[PDB]
Design a protein around this ligand. Structure first.
Ligand SMILES: O=P(O)(O)C(O)(Cc1cccnc1)P(=O)(O)O
Ligand SMILES: O=P(O)(O)C(O)(Cc1cccnc1)P(=O)(O)O
Ligand SMILES: C=C(C)CCOP(=O)(O)OP(=O)(O)O
Ligand SMILES: C=C(C)CCOP(=O)(O)OP(=O)(O)O
Ligand SMILES: [Mg+2]
Ligand SMILES: [Mg+2]
Ligand SMILES: [Mg+2]
Ligand SMILES: [Mg+2]
Ligand SMILES: [Mg+2]
Ligand SMILES: [Mg+2]
Lengths: 340, 340
């Protein structure tokens, strides 16, 4: 049922590539196809599926014609492309090794830093699909501005993420709960959680500022939880399941884990963290992981996950109306107690 | 008069930064200001000035109110930002050392590959300025789509540029006039020449497909000449004037110079080019430069420049109407016989 919905969405990718890859310029188009095939496939497709599922739940079935449904999974694929663009660039800036069970696109021999332009192409494909399928719709401009604003919000979050994580500089003093909340709100919460539901809302004709603000209250909080889970999985997740190798400790990141470590550490443990964090040495990384386990941070995360799920459920009860609670409940079911 | 126009446009940059850089998120905004100050200033401002000059020449002066003029130099600064975004990324992918008389932004200690996200921020600022100043104008959507399409065209050209220039692989067979024309049309001609004039045209209410197609005929040809001049300057330009160190030979680029070399080379000279092109060794680079001089390529360029200027002038006579010829003549005067 949920895997059947996933299969139906993935089966539309062949048409997405086809319409995007329709002279000497043919070699560039062939490279775009390779870029699309490598970087837009292999994930969970939760964002793209959220557009499709929310649209169906928000639009009267007698208004869900063949062209309307096609626009909905096209916009779903635009959200996947936005995610693909940010991940290709993020893997370069985070010096990552693997993504979605395979070597990072930039790590491929013959790709390297050309992946910067490939990431820009993925971003360009969003607006090509919006023009091709939604140009005559009343929500066209609302969708363009939403994808543009979501990109700006993500980039500002990425800036905060990279600034708080300087290579070669100890930045323990900046690893506060307040800084953490700000980074994750902008780098992840806006584009991974608000964007898919707000896109389906605009397509359903729900353009009201108050309805978008109420949806935002639930979704930004859901996004914060999702990034916290991502930070936990960076170190304590199974790479065969997650499809990626963690780098947060080596990269001196303001991870949820380092924030929690600092709140619980003795002065002796603070020194261990200071001497071993944000460095390439495997033994220094192993020393930080041992400290996190000593401070029962996996147990602290399990308790956080329980408290956060109840909080998000309380926000759904307060702010879902007049939207069907299932719109938010479906997405919460998908991400809570997730190990991928 | 022309330098006075330049000074007037540059004097608006302080307001552009101010409105773009208006919580923990303040550190990211401070980084955006640094990114804007470093990368949007130091050039010739020909693209931004073209928007301002063309708008004034296309709009009736009794319709050029204070807000209308402000929108025109704002859109001029959007074109400068588009240029800044592509240059920050291009300098990483081309392994460049200097730009606009200073070290490339990514070469700065403490910047590095974080410059990828900085380049994305510059791109985001275009749509922030368009929303802030042109959202209520009838040409708002035409401007958004024009900047989005110009970016896609540039990125597809960049893809062709990088594909024809593989590191560690001889690609002499692909350095044809046909391939060269395709690369430069997409990577430079569309966004550096069509984009500024088409933006001013849309702001003047000139949205007709036929008028935009005629303008495009002149401007894409002007853009091809401009890229040819850029390729000539990469090797034979004065770096104190150009503000940048050439890398085309080391980067195995499909430069206009290598295309002309291949058309004139004997089998003995073809071998010298094959053994020495696309490599880091300074003596191999010096050997290629000696071959170009032996084949009188600076004289071939001077003759090309004369023939091209006459051709572009013939295109202005055929396609300028009903637009004032001065719109195209001003831009042609600015770029012809340029050494910067
Ligand atoms: O997949 P990743 O690399 O763990 C991540 O979530 C990717 C990402 C990229 C851009 C914005 N938000 C998340 P990160 O933040 O680098 O921890
Ligand atoms: O300024 P540059 O680096 O000489 C150049 O013109 C810059 C550039 C970047 C993107 C598109 N067009 C030109 P390039 O093409 O790399 O020779
Ligand atoms: C914004 C986040 C935290 C990055 C990864 O998102 P996902 O975990 O949803 O990765 P994919 O399913 O798209 O592969
Ligand atoms: C698209 C081209 C060939 C790259 C440089 O353009 P400019 O020579 O106009 O550089 P700036 O004036 O903006 O510094
Ligand atoms: Mg990462
Ligand atoms: Mg990251
Ligand atoms: Mg992570
Ligand atoms: Mg370059
Ligand atoms: Mg280049
Ligand atoms: Mg050049």
């Amino acid at each position: 049922v949920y895997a059947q919905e996933k299969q139906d969405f993935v089966q539309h990718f062949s048409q997405i590539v086809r319409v995007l890859t329709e002279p000497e310029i043919g070699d560039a188009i062939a490279r775009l196809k390779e870029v699309l095939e490598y970087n837009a496939i292999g994930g969970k497709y939760n964002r793209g599926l959220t557009v499709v599922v929310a649209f169906r739940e928000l639009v009267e079935p007698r208004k869900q014609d063949a062209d309307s449904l096609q626009r909905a999974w096209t916009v779903g694929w635009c959200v996947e492309l936005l995610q693909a663009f940010f991940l290709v660039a993020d893997d370069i800036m985070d010096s990552s090794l693997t993504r979605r069970g395979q070597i990072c696109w930039y790590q491929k021999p013959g790709v390297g830093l050309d992946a910067i332009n490939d990431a820009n192409l993925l971003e360009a494909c969003i607006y090509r699909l919006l023009k091709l399928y939604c140009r005559e719709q009343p929500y066209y401009l609302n969708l363009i501005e939403l994808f543009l604003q979501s990109s700006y919000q993500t980039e500002i979050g990425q800036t905060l993420d990279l600034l708080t994580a300087p290579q070669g500089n100890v930045d323990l003093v900046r690893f506060t709960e307040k800084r953490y909340k700000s980074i994750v709100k902008y780098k992840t919460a806006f584009a991974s959680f608000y964007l898919p539901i707000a896109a389906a809302m605009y397509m359903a004709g729900i353009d009201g500022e108050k309805e978008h603000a109420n949806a935002k209250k639930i979704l930004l909080e859901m996004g914060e939880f999702f990034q916290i889970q991502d930070d936990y999985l960076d170190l304590f997740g199974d790479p065969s399941v997650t499809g990626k190798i963690g780098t947060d400790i080596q990269d001196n990141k303001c991870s949820w884990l380092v924030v929690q470590c600092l709140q619980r550490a003795t002065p002796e443990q603070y020194q261990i963290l200071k001497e071993n964090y944000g460095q390439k040495e495997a033994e220094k990384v192993a020393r930080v992981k041992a400290l996190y386990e000593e401070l029962d941070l996996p147990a602290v995360f399990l308790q956080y996950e329980e408290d956060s799920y109840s909080h998000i459920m309380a926000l759904i009860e307060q702010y879902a109306a007049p939207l069907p609670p299932a719109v938010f409940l479906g997405l919460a079911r998908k991400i809570y107690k997730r190990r991928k």
